[PDB]
Amino acid sequence: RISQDELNNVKKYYNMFGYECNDYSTKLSDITSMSICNWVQFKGIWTLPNVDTGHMNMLRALFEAGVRLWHKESDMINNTVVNNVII
Amino acid sequence: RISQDELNNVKKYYNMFGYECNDYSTKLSDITSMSICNWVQFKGIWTLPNVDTGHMNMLRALFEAGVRLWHKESDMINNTVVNNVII
Amino acid sequence: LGLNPINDKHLLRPNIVTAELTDYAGNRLPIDLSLIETNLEFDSFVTMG
Amino acid sequence: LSKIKLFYNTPFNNMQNTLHFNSNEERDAYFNSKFDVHEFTSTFNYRGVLRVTIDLVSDRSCFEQLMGVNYCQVQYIQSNRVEYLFVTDIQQL
Amino acid sequence: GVLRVTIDLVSDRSCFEQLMGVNYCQVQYIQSNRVEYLFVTDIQQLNDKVCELSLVPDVVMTYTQGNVLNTLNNVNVIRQHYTQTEYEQNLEQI
Numbered sequence A, B: 001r002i003s004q005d006e007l008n009n010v011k012k013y014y015n016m017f018g019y020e021c022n023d024y025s026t027k028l029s030d031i032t033s034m035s036i037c038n039w040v041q042f043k044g045i046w047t048l049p050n051v052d053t054g055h056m057n058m059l060r061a062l063f064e065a066g067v068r069l070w071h072k073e074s075d076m077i078n079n080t081v082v083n084n085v086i087i
Numbered sequence C: 001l002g003l004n005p006i007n008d009k010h011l012l013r014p015n016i017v018t019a020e021l022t023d024y025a026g027n028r029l030p031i032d033l034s035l036i037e038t039n040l041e042f043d044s045f046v047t048m049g
Numbered sequence D: 001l002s003k004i005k006l007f008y009n010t011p012f013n014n015m016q017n018t019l020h021f022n023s024n025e026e027r028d029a030y031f032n033s034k035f036d037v038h039e040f041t042s043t044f045n046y047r048g049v050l051r052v053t054i055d056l057v058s059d060r061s062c063f064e065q066l067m068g069v070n071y072c073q074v075q076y077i078q079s080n081r082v083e084y085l086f087v088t089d090i091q092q093l
Numbered sequence E: 001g002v003l004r005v006t007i008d009l010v011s012d013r014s015c016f017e018q019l020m021g022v023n024y025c026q027v028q029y030i031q032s033n034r035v036e037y038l039f040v041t042d043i044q045q046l047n048d049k050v051c052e053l054s055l056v057p058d059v060v061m062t063y064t065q066g067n068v069l070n071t072l073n074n075v076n077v078i079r080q081h082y083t084q085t086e087y088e089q090n091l092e093q094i
Helices: A004-017 A053-063 B004-017 B053-063 D024-031 E059-063 E084-090
Strands: A019-026 A039-043 B037-040 B067-070 C019-022 C028-031 D003-008 D017-019 D069-076 D081-086 E003-008 E024-028 E035-039 E043-045 E050-057 E075-080
Touching (some): A039 A053, A053 D069, A053 E059, E035 E059
Parallel strands (some): B067 D017
Antiparallel strands (some): A019 E075, A039 E075, C019 C028, D003 D069, D069 D081, E003 E050, E024 E035, E043 E050
8 A cells, every 4th residue: 555644645635635536517516525625627518507708708718727625624624634535 | 347437427428529530621420410410520622602811710610619509409418429329 | 456446446447566477587467457346366277187 | 879688698708619500691680689688789899809888768677788898789870781799898987 | 907995993992993804795786686795805994984995896796696697708818727527638738
């Protein structure tokens, strides 16, 4: 095995950035799936109902680069990520 | 074989972006060929009868980078691509 | 392996854990631990006499 | 000088994905069957990338907030040739 | 983006610009009472009495709460986390 630390550094990486994916054309897996936070990153073409055309863009291209949607504030500033989990 | 999912991710890829081609000098295969949508990407030199010289350009260079010509609206926003097909 | 059985199955791959057999006489069996669906079960094909 | 028509919440928002009909009338027919708030008349200055100054004073709870627009049509009166445009942004004067 | 909110403070006693740990703000637009949050890039000091706030809107925060994201379809996803079920399916790949 790799070392106790390195093992964790890896655990963390997946916890923080989820999984490489190549599903051109699907629907996102539930955003509320994880327990601590929940990365989401995708590319056009989607429109959200009734939004400044240019906030969309700003929105589109924000996810194309990815957004870590946290699920509790505590965690946003605590060494918890390590324990993210699928319910 | 590769996995059920990977298999689909691949199916999709071809469905959405068609096929690598190197036919300097042909005529496009019918644009209405597929059932769900129909990628098309090609490089000068073509002129469309009677168009703003500078909309051509904008046009030319838009295809040189490629355009996915969808064929029904439903599909533009549904997990259908998966089932694109040659009639 | 000290993984958590519940949410760590995805770490069962060869840069995180590894597996090898040996008879201490220079016969070996290298095992890509990513290629077992669920279980590390060893059988044998033996003949005798 | 020309007859604008601004479509709301439409899928058409990247230049790499379009829809395709077998005749521009069917195109137009389609488009002319899905509207959602305003449809005026201007004579907009074209120089891409251009601007359409568009006024709304009969408001009650709006200001800028005629929002989901991205795509629009322009039937130029009167050669009645037609032309669609995306709308990059929306500034509030 | 990117805009500015001229904001005044004259009832001071030991301030000037020094209302300091601001980054995020809210705006309840009166009166459609729709709401919108923005980050604040910077904070320029025009004088002893009035400072300026540069803003850029947190489009994420503003527009994405609830179930919205999960109904979008035909999207090309690039990384996400998976529901137990969707994980098992992608397990070999990962």
